[PDB]
């Protein structure tokens, strides 16, 4: 009853792996790619302004 729980741990991560496939497929179909460049712009400003 322990390694079944351990296998339950391992299998649960495995459907989370294909969950990321569902997650990542959700990542590629957004206008955020347009919005994400502004995220770099504000971030890179915060980066070198620190120096």
């Amino acid at each position: 009853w322990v390694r079944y729980e351990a296998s339950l741990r391992q299998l649960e991560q495995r459907q989370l792996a294909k969950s990321v496939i569902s997650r990542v497929q959700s990542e590629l179909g957004n206008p955020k790619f347009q919005e994400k460049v502004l995220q770099q712009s504000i971030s890179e400003i915060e980066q070198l302004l620190s120096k």
């Binding site: 741990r9 391992q10 649960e12 991560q13 971030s43 980066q47 070198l48 120096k51």
Partner: protein
């Protein structure tokens, strides 16, 4: 399991924090990638041997620092790397985590938990290339390492901080002696006296994953994994990882050595270390040496092995015992790497297939198998108190020295013949059955006062087992007295002789 979800969330937030705090400009650009090699334009101020990250996510070590472009080996496959990729600099030399949470876990060359039992609790982080202790900060080897093998205990002593080589041929029993020692250390690894604890650390460079799976199943069956650490470099991993793994394991053991404890390293099949280094050097266009090996393989092996030592009382009197393994092709010990390793170690344990097929299961060639330490690093009970355990080496040399060329001349020759053949049949042992000094002493002591009267050769094995029974029953006082005090006193010699002759009459 929602807990790993927020764990991953905070992982990703610190991932962002770390990634967007670099603003690097010396981050180089990949010019070309070879078979696990990548020359990169950039990294003007890169240190030697320094770790790097590729934009894909593969690690790399800075071997060649020629002007302009830098030679980077790959800890992994060249699968995901292309030209014109930004190469991140770690800022530190290649490092491996060290600590006491390593026990019971299996990791890779870098030190990542590969067994799949969660993260690793590391008390520190040490270099893969650390300097060996100096001439003064060390002490001579005096405490003996109890192998559990009678032929490896009473004939070729090993101790804390020595370097004993298991030289031999393929599938002769090279790993058997190491695993037997690991199992034998369980007797004192379950106690409280830390001066007698021997944690085991083992390298697996080149062995297939199935073999290491069987091995770890073995240590957990006999309940030895709790004090053992396994680092694995299968042939599937890239050559840099295999080349690096033994150094990381050396640092792992040096943690215990410098912390005052005692540890044992098994450098299993150090030859494939050499072939991985060959692949590295050849792929870097470094001029080769003899028979296509890189020149500095002797330095490679010396720096690795000499890190094992017995420290002196000032620093903590820690120890680290090296147990390297070298396989030879057709018994050719004149081969280059075999010669280097026989010249680098503090003795050797020769195993050959011919004695293995002769019945001798340990297959220890006592003619060549020698230890640079004798009386030192040996339990006294297996020493001058037993008398002949100072000089069985001469006896086994002479018995081989009169087999047919020194044909039996008189009754003395016949007596020596019978004695020697009875002893050689006595030294036989089986794998997965470690033994202890307190019952080594009676068996070989019987080898001086009544051994030719053994009940024919095919039945001397149950003779030794029944002798052990007759001494563990009704005679436990002898076994105890010789096991705590570690030597045989005059009255103790008299009692042992009396018991031996009593069972001889039996």
């Amino acid at each position: 399991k929602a807990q790993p979800t927020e764990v991953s969330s905070i992982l990703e937030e610190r991932i962002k924090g770390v990634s967007d705090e670099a603003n690097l400009n010396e981050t180089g650009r990949v010019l070309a990638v070879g078979d696990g090699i990548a020359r990169v334009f950039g990294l003007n101020n890169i240190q030697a041997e320094e770790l790097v990250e590729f934009s894909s996510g593969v690690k790399g070590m800075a071997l060649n620092l020629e002007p302009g472009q830098v030679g980077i080996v790959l800890f992994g496959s060249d699968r995901l790397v292309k030209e014109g990729e930004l190469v991140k600099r770690t800022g530190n030399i290649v490092d491996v985590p060290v600590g006491p949470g390593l026990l019971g876990r299996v990791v890779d060359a870098l030190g990542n938990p590969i067994d799949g039992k969660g993260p690793i609790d590391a008390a520190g982080r040490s270099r893969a290339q650390v300097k060996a202790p100096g001439i003064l900060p060390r002490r001579s080897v005096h405490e003996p390492v109890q192998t559990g093998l009678k032929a490896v205990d009473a004939l070729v002593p090993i101790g804390r901080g020595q370097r004993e080589l298991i030289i031999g041929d393929r599938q002769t029993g090279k790993t058997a002696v190491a695993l037997d020692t690991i199992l034998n250390q369980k007797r004192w690894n379950n106690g409280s006296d830390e001066s007698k604890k021997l944690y085991c650390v083992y390298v697996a460079v080149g062995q297939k994953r199935s073999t290491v799976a069987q091995l770890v199943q073995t240590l957990e069956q006999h309940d030895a994994m709790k004090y053992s650490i396994i680092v694995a470099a299968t042939a599937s991993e890239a050559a840099p990882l295999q080349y690096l793994a033994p150094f990381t394991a050396a640092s792992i053991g040096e943690w215990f050595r410098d912390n005052g404890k005692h540890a044992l390293i098994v450098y299993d099949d150090l030859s494939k270390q050499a072939v991985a280094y060959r692949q590295l050097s050849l792929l870097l266009r470094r001029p080769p040496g003899r028979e296509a090996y890189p020149g500095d393989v002797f330095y490679l092996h010396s720096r690795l092995l000499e890190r094992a030592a017995k420290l002196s009382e000032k620093e903590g009197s820690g120890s680290l015992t090296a147990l390297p393994v070298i396989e030879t092709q057709g018994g050719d010990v004149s081969a280059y790497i075999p010669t280097n390793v026989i010249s680098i170690t503090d003795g050797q344990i020769f195993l050959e297939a011919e004695l293995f097929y002769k019945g001798i299961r340990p297959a220890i060639n006592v003619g060549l198998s020698v230890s640079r330490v004798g009386s030192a690093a040996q339990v006294k009970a297996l020493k001058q108190v037993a008398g002949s355990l100072k000089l069985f080496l001469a006896q086994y040399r002479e018995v081989a020295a009169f087999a047919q060329f020194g044909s039996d001349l008189d009754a003395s020759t016949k007596q020596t013949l019978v004695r020697g053949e009875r002893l050689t049949q006595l030294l036989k042992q089986n794998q997965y059955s470690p033994l202890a000094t307190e019952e080594q002493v009676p068996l070989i002591y019987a080898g001086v006062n009544g051994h030719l009267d053994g009940i024919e050769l095919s039945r001397i094995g149950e003779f030794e087992s029944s002798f052990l029974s007759y001494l563990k029953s009704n005679h436990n006082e002898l076994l105890t007295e010789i096991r705590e005090k570690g030597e045989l006193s005059k009255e103790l010699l008299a009692s042992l002789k009396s018991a031996t002759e009593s069972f001889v009459a039996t």
